[PDB]
Amino acid sequence: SGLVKMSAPSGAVENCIVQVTCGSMTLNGLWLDNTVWCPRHIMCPADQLTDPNYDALLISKTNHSFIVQKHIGAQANLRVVAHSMVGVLLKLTVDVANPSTPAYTFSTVKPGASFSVLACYNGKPTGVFTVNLRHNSTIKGSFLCGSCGSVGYTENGGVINFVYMHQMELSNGTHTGSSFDGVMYGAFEDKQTHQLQLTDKYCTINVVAWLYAAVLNGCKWFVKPTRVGIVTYNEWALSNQFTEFVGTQSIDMLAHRTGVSVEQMLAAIQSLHAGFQGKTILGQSTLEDEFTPDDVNMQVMGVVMQ
Amino acid sequence: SGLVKMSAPSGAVENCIVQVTCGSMTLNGLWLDNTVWCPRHIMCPADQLTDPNYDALLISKTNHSFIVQKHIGAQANLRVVAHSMVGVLLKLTVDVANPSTPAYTFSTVKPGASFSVLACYNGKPTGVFTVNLRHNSTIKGSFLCGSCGSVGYTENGGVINFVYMHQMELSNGTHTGSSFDGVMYGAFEDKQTHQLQLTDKYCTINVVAWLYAAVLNGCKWFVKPTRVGIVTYNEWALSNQFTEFVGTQSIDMLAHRTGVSVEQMLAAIQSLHAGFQGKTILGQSTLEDEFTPDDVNMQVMGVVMQ
Numbered sequence: 001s002g003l004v005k006m007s008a009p010s011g012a013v014e015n016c017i018v019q020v021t022c023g024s025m026t027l028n029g030l031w032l033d034n035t036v037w038c039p040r041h042i043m044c045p046a047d048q049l050t051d052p053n054y055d056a057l058l059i060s061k062t063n064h065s066f067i068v069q070k071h072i073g074a075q076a077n078l079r080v081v082a083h084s085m086v087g088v089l090l091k092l093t094v095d096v097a098n099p100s101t102p103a104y105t106f107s108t109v110k111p112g113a114s115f116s117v118l119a120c121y122n123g124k125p126t127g128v129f130t131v132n133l134r135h136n137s138t139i140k141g142s143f144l145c146g147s148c149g150s151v152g153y154t155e156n157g158g159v160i161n162f163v164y165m166h167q168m169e170l171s172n173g174t175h176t177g178s179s180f181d182g183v184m185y186g187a188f189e190d191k192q193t194h195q196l197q198l199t200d201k202y203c204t205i206n207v208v209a210w211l212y213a214a215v216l217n218g219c220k221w222f223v224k225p226t227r228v229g230i231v232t233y234n235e236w237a238l239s240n241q242f243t244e245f246v247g248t249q250s251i252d253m254l255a256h257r258t259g260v261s262v263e264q265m266l267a268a269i270q271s272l273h274a275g276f277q278g279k280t281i282l283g284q285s286t287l288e289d290e291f292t293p294d295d296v297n298m299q300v301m302g303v304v305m306q
Numbered sequence: 307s308g309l310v311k312m313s314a315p316s317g318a319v320e321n322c323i324v325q326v327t328c329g330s331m332t333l334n335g336l337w338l339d340n341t342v343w344c345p346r347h348i349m350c351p352a353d354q355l356t357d358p359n360y361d362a363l364l365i366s367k368t369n370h371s372f373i374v375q376k377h378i379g380a381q382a383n384l385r386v387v388a389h390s391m392v393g394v395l396l397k398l399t400v401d402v403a404n405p406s407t408p409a410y411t412f413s414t415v416k417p418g419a420s421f422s423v424l425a426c427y428n429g430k431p432t433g434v435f436t437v438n439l440r441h442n443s444t445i446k447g448s449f450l451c452g453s454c455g456s457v458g459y460t461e462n463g464g465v466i467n468f469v470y471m472h473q474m475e476l477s478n479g480t481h482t483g484s485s486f487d488g489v490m491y492g493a494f495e496d497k498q499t500h501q502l503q504l505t506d507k508y509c510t511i512n513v514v515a516w517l518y519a520a521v522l523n524g525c526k527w528f529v530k531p532t533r534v535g536i537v538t539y540n541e542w543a544l545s546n547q548f549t550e551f552v553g554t555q556s557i558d559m560l561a562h563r564t565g566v567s568v569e570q571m572l573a574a575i576q577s578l579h580a581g582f583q584g585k586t587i588l589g590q591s592t593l594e595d596e597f598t599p600d601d602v603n604m605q606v607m608g609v610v611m612q
């Protein structure tokens with residue numbers, strides 16, 4: 001038992017991290033087969049970060065403009081033989097394929113989904129943590145500018161699913177990046193101008209999953225006979241910065257295991273939002289919405305007790 | 307910017323995880339050079355868990371009683387050629403040296419210290435998270451049956467420092483294990499009986515470090531001119547379940563970088579302990595005490611704002 005923020009083991013991803021340098025800028029890249037991926041703003045000079053003309057920048061670089069180095073494991077200096085833009089990513093073709101390329105897929109996650117982040121700095125892995133894609137398609141992470149190119153991923157059956165490459169900090173503790181098709185998460189441009197973020201919301205289904213984990217972990221003081229219909233909850237949610245609730249088979253099974261209905265959990269959310277009344281749930285006095293039902297399922301399988 | 311619970315990248319450790327089986331019991335082991343470590347309760351039958359005679363069990367076992375397999379990476383079946391007891395651990399000698407043994411050291415962490423855990427099942431790494439050794443030398447992690455032998459570690463300059471091998475669950479969300487000298491963390495025995503846990507406390511120096519992190523991340527509403535001396539706070543702490551404060555150079559450096567004194571922070575703790583009053587700090591409504599000064603230092607390196 002116990003519930004903690006958990007990441008997928010990072011070894012397979014660590015083997016793919018490289019350092020990329022262009023002019024005075026350096027950051028991290030991901031080396032898969034004969035390709036190195038990094039944010040395209042590595043091309044932008046310090047004095048043009050406000051209005052970068054990436055097409056002009058691209059054309060002003062040679063293959064030799066890009067120095068790519070592997071620091072950890074079997075070291076390497078990699079020769080770039082082509083460079084092009086893929087959305088807000090630079091795609092560098094190199095003359096050697098990464099022999100430690102894992103089996104992998106690219107995916108784009110949806111708001112409310114979690115993934116692991118390998119934080120990197122100057123081509124070296126430095127930390128691992130887990131984030132959730134927020135309702136406004138930002139993440140709440142921990143990065144420096146030199147952390148750009150850090151990689152978000154999930155893992156299933158030995159296959160690494162790459163979903164995120166870190167691009168920018170939007171406001172304090174608030175970040176975004178792109179999927180590996182080069183599409184930025186959220187309504188965000190890779191330039192140094194203030195950009196307005198859409199309002200964030202609590203992911204209701206994740207909160208519900210968390211309350212079920214709490215109950216399976218012996219914490220049930222917040223469960224009352226009170227219930228609220230989904231239609232009523234959803235009207236309330238629109239006025240209180242929560243997402244609309246739509247049930248899933250996974251949630252139904254947690255209901256089954258605990259004897260606590262989804263309508264009771266939605267009622268508890270409404271009550272807890274008004275105040276925790278000096279009490280805690282799994283150590284917290286705020287609602288937790290970054291565990292998905294899948295995340296919770298991985299960490300439970302205990303029997304509900306008395 | 308941003309502050310998250312950060313774990314050390316796990317690749318070097320993943321390369322060292324094996325499965326160990328003895329009779330009907332299986333769990334995880336750590337393979338370094340020609341040695342495999344695992345909890346000694348792998349020898350215990352399910353009907354003798356309340357009072358195992360580990361010396362007798364040891365003698366009844368032979369080298370061939372132990373089956374050791376590596377299921378990931380370069381897979382292998384390892385022959386056990388010696389076995390001996392090391393406190394609550396078994397030390398198995400195997401006939402093949404782990405070719406991916408990292409540079410490593412062993413140490414025993416103190417209450418208030420953090421470390422990373424690679425959670426494993428059937429000899430397969432499954433998750434990474436960070437914990438803090440509690441005042442009563444338990445950890446609040448996330449472990450299921452089959453996780454015994456999971457490995458806790460830190461990183462010291464290209465060196466993996468192993469500090470924990472998972473042994474048991476004590477109560478909901480409450481765990482302990484041993485360092486690799488075979489000494490159990492805390493006043494706990496590796497048997498299936500209810501054991502009393504000494505009272506836990508908030509780690510004051512960690513809470514202080516967290517408040518400093520908050521300030522460096524632009525959260526400062528809780529900082530008042532009020533100041534409480536160390537001696538006075540330490541009197542207060544004894545009666546309010548906080549550890550006594552003892553200054554260190556880390557914290558001093560954080561105090562200098564931010565210009566805010568320890569006494570102001572100790573004062574803030576007293577006030578926040580009474581209640582956050584609707585406001586939040588880094589998104590929380592409770593005091594956070596599992597970031598060490600060192601953990602905070604690694605995630606800061608911005609300039610102090612206003």
Ligand SMILES: O=C(Nc1ccc(N(Cc2ccsc2)C(=O)Cn2nnc3ccccc32)cc1)c1cccs1
Pocket residue numbers: 024025041044045046049050052143144145146147148167168169170189190191192307
């Ligand atoms: O600094 C440089 N470049 C730089 C690159 C990116 C950034 N930006 C904003 C941005 C995105 C596209 S253009 C400007 C970050 O967010 C970057 N970013 N991404 N995550 C961050 C966390 C903290 C601080 C910054 C962070 C800003 C600057 C240098 C260029 C030549 C020599 S140095």
Ligand SMILES: O=C(Nc1ccc(N(Cc2ccsc2)C(=O)Cn2nnc3ccccc32)cc1)c1cccs1
Pocket residue numbers: 001330331347350351352355449450451452453454473474475476495496497498
């Ligand atoms: O089950 C078996 N053995 C077993 C081993 C350890 C355990 N224990 C308690 C304990 C510690 C020393 S002796 C008994 C756990 O805590 C184990 N542990 N460790 N972390 C746990 C988290 C959740 C639940 C249990 C957890 C209990 C049982 C079988 C033996 C032969 C066939 S099966």
